[PDB]
Symmetry: D2
Subunit: 444 residues, 4 copies
């Protein structure tokens, strides 16, 4: 439990989930705005018009952050505010983020900035979106202005959050925005996201001559086989390939996994979207590696499935989301990354869980939630003792927010939010986390 | 508004594993569904049909309930593992129960409609490969013969198979029902043998046994509709229609499999040698009636990421507690289509009904929502017979709240509420209504 | 024994790139085939249409040969890169050649039948995507528009496309023809845009321009037969028939694609959004005739390892030098089928002929083998017209020995032998005989 | 042209290609008999009824082998001679082989024996052939009787020859016997061939405690991309996996390549034929590794192929078969096997070429065939200098023979054969190969 003095505690949010003010400050609609209006996609047509109203109440949320004592606050910049039209910079929107990052340092908080957290402007989407290769140049223009204006203030940069979500989860299964269901589109989308990542890192480090730490965050879910039979092992491999290896291998090994390419060849009949001079750029050296972790997945074989797999039954204890609680399996995942992929310092940029919390006499007794977080904080200590060099942990999420396709029915926040009144109320969960940070900063 | 002719049959329906229980007595061995209920993650909270509605012991009581409805027909199924608990070994104690039942129904002036196969395949047959094995055709005729020999005099009508789409594709391809396999190659062979076993049994009964007792198959049919007028959605609907409907309708009425589905299934099914010479002519053997299980429609749209190029589409319709669309208009389209494209045989609706979140209050469940549902479809039936569509009967699914398969006891389709802890039956709202509907219909006639 | 009706047209046929030569003369720019010849392994020993039959210069010479055959009609194609060597840049020099050609034939008493597209797509269109691109519809109308304005008065009949299966599937799927791509997704759009451009070109001439010149399309057709009577081989035939024939026949006459083929192609093609609203109605626009190119049948069997489930089966038929089956009985089968299911338009056999190992000896060529082939088919045509199949005409492929695409100059289809060194035209026995067949028919007339 | 002092030169044949005597000595028909009779499968319905008539002329061919001075002669055993019926051993059949092995030893020639060379008996095929898992147990019954009676005489054992041909080429493409076209049957056949290999090896090394060298021979063809684009490399990977890694990985790594499994999943929708313990048995340690090498294949990408390849155009000098002459790429392949796969001793169990041989005055002067073999032997010589440890080399083929689907139209032999006289005539190349052996032995002191 003895975290090193340089160890960083944090909390995290994303712009569309909390900001609101959807038509104010020059903001134009995003892909998610249009997704919310597509039928059958989101719980009861819920949207991010208002959300946590963070764009107006940003100063107030900073106050909450100071008392927790977190070293770092991770937030995302809303693209359709910065470029509501192509090539058209909106200074009111950037102004909001510049003061905010400056203000966090004044209150002694390191700002960690996510460039892309899924909020693609509608103008980009209508030209094909990420499926179009031009999407690469549009993102660097977006990233450049942010670098120009904020690099002196900001502590760390994150290019993309969960390309698996924005790519496959978004363009193949059609659950997230823009809700397309086309595997050919999906692999072109992912590649251009990853390629846009590498060009921006390249741009910042060489041209812009900046030494601000930059890297990517990938969400990783380890996959396990039900039996030792050959069938169940193939399912694991493909599940691991689909969620994890398709992204890790190009980032660290500068190649795509041929086993997944052959499986995807049932839908993807050309890889000419891979131009000469891409995978080396994609695999450009970063200063750190970012990991979003939430759970594992147990898989078994399916003969009727195109990818030969379906989800199997878990008897493990499960959260309100139905996700497995898996701190042991979390420990398994990191050793693999050091052993096979990378020795860079890792930052856990998101972790948390949803349960059905009931407010009783002004307080929420979420002891179930406490257990989940503590078990992972215990794992982080054990792993730094193992030499896994985990220099930080960001708790997802700071506030209860718009939880994508589940809407406001699921609460990941450490701060409860009455979405009717926009009132901020500190949960019982802070009691330990607020105190752990104080306690850690006491031993020195 | 909804009148019917003098020979019109009102009915209600059940299946064997869903209500009987007593899985140990009278020589019964386990079926595929017993083991399936014990497999983790497949059925709601590991629920099973060990006790069920305990209908095996209180069948005489349930007979009185049928009598009081005044219904002309009762449709039930025969449990195979009670009749052949091991390969080749007949158990006359199990048969006597069904012999007594048919006789008791005859004494009370009620027509027994009997389903031979309602998805409860004995384990010994499964362990030899089940419906996947071509010998299965022969097992079922041995099973059917014994039933014919003892019950053909008493019984008014025979049903060979109930919803082979369910017993086949959702069970062998999608893995939701027993035995819970997921293999399209396995799925089409299973279906083929089921349809072939139906036809061989029908051929054996009318030719060799020379019996005139009405016999037929029961298919569930769900008409499919496009979200948009685009070409894509037309492809999607066609394929959805082929998967659920055309794959089963074409062999029964055209003596051929639809080549468009064969081509789509060739992604998983790389040989059709299971279709032997002579088979397709047997499947299309002339029947006395056609049976339809109807519940709802399905709206579908195109999917590039889907192997069959289709996914379920959002419906703005009023929905049941199951989430199923209420679709009496679309029902009429299906029936009109069948006459136009497939058959002019007399149709019987062997299952129709709905599940809603029933609450017990002062010994009563005020399921006006279910009354409305049932009423609209019975109204639709009357309208179609005015068009000459010749729907000669209707069986209401279901008589009792029961084990609803993978949903367990969590979903209630019954007109009777059942406290499974106490086995109490309680008559409510409808059924009196259904009894009143038949009474009102009876009272116009002299 | 033949006997043809008095209004019956006899003809012979060519295509522009196969005979014209003059590849760099008259403002002509390279075509896809020009580019296609210089890729390795695609065409026999790198042969090209640079010189070819040099017909651009000697066209005056060749008109007399055509006149001597006594043919009613001469079919030729127009080279697109001669008419539009650059986008929107009309070349009056290139066109001037073809009006003169057509004018001279009218003076010699010969009907000019003109094919707009015979596979020679200009390179500028290909570099922008070619037929895969929807703009190709628009490019063709500009090309088609200039030709309708200047020639519609002289010409007797118009053929929009020759063998879109070759230009489409052989070119974009199998990679054998120009531009040699191997992509089924690209392939279905290319065919679709070819078929759509046809419908627009027909719509343009008769609606806007109000003209009554007979117009239609030419499809190559090959009837398909199952090796065995098994279910598998029936599927194999269905799928072979669809790839070659129904995919083209159904849109032209039914205004729809065969869903069974769409499902088989869904292993490579995962969206049909290229089919816009209105497209299918344009494709099925009423024509004056239907053209058929016939060469052979194809015997197929089932293959589990084949994506389209078929391979070629061993044939005991008499054979040409190329290995294509000689199938006059099967030719009659195709025509009867067309009248029953598809169309009652007047049919024209726009190409028929054969290739054999022709040697020139002592100034004359005794090609009785080629005669036999043609003889068997001409009797059949007369027989079909007795049955009422209303075949108003026949074109004999070809006139001269020419560039046979990927096979080059190794294969001779001509009734006139060509020494490619001197470019001398020498009449084969078959040309005199065919001329004599017409003469005898004409002498029978009045 | 340097060789180790213990290096073995040799030649090789197979039973159905040379033996003949198709209805003599108790032999029953093989799958290859029926395949030859199916229309359009083999050149002009040719078959192995007479072939080189080696069953009768075994004494003459033994002399020819002794004169070449080859250290080793490799031949295959005809299964339908040994088990003409199910469960019924035929000692008359074994006698033919017993004299041959005994006569070779007398002449100082080491016999290297291939157990399975594609001539599966008809009783087995009609029960499913290699598609049935039982086929594993039949081959062990076949192998056991061979070990008890011949393991004392024989110098080396080869369990299976080219499971790619017998498996994929036979059950997937349809070019070889039994000429089926079903990938599911094919992958089941391959696994059972490989499993039967390993179970037979285990019996020899554990129960019979015998140290006679045993191993498998795979044919390997290295794969090269036409261009350096990403597309053409994926095409290459899949060709490499289909021809090579599908066989090398289970034998040496004890696993199937998941990349190939996914690609084959378009046809193969269950892998329950891989029982537990199977892959463990297959990778049981062998004494050597056999390689049949003939050529490379240059491939490029094609979007309309299921396996993403249709082969690319080659500008290399080519044989009469149309196969590339590729000794440089051969040196790459061996290096690859040492880096990734095995340090076992390597034997080149088949190498050779077909050229349009013209008989002129009791002579067919095949200098072109001499070039081919000499180039490869130099490459063999160059590799041993690197330490690649190639202990031996068998020249294909001893005589002109039945070349399967090509029939008697093609000639791989160093000895020409007039099929109407059945005369064996040596070429200068035969003399040359003999003189190479002579020149090797000659430099000792």
């Amino acid at each position: 439990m003895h975290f090193k003095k340089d160890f960083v505690f944090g909390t995290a949010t994303s712009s569309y989930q909390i900001e609101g003010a959807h038509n104010e400050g020059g903001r134009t609609p995003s892909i998610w705005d249009m997704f919310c209006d597509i039928d059958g996609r989101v719980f009861e047509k819920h949207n991010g018009d208002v959300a946590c109203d963070h764009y107006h109440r940003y100063e107030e949320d900073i106050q909450h952050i100071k008392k927790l004592g977190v070293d770092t606050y991770r937030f995302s910049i809303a693209w359709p505010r910065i470029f509501p039209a192509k090539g058209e910079y909106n200074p009111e929107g950037m102004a909001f983020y510049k003061n905010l990052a400056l203000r966090l340092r004044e209150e002694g908080i390191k700002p960690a900035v996510t460039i892309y957290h899924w909020d693609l402007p509608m103008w980009a989407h209508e030209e094909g979106g990420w499926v179009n290769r031009e999407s690469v140049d549009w993102f660097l223009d977006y990233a450049k202005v942010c670098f120009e204006e904020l690099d002196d203030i900001v502590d760390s940069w994150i290019t993309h959050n969960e390309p698996w979500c924005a790519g496959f989860l978004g363009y193949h299964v059609g659950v997230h925005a823009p809700g397309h269901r086309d595997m050919n589109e999906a692999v072109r989308a992912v590649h251009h996201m990853l390629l846009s990542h590498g060009k921006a890192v390249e741009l910042l480090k060489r041209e812009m001559k900046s030494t601000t730490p930059i890297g990517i965050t990938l969400n990783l879910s380890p996959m396990y086989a039900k039996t030792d039979s050959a069938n169940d092992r193939l399912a694991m491999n493909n599940a691991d390939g689909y969620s994890n290896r398709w992204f890790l291998d190009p980032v660290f090994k500068g190649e795509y996994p041929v086993d997944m390419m052959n499986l995807f060849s049932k839908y993807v009949h050309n890889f000419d979207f891979i131009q000469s001079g891409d995978m080396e750029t994609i695999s450009t050296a970063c200063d750190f590696f970012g990991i979003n972790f939430y759970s594992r997945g147990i898989v078994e074989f399916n003969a009727a499935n195109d990818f030969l797999k379906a989800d199997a039954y878990s008897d493990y204890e499960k959260t309100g989301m139905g996700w497995d609680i898996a701190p042991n399996e979390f420990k398994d995942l990191i050793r693999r990354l050091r052993a096979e992929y990378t020795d860079l310092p890792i930052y856990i940029t998101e972790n948390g869980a949803a349960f059905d919390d009931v407010l009783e006499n002004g307080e929420v007794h979420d002891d179930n939630r406490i257990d989940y977080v503590r078990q992972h904080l215990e794992a982080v200590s054990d792993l730094n003792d193992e030499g896994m060099n985990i220099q930080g942990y960001y708790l997802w999420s700071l506030m209860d927010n718009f939880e994508w396709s589940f809407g406001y029915e699921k609460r990941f926040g450490i701060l409860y939010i009455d979405f009717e009144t926009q009132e901020r109320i500190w949960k019982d969960s802070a009691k330990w986390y607020a105190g752990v940070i104080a306690d850690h900063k006491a031993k020195h």
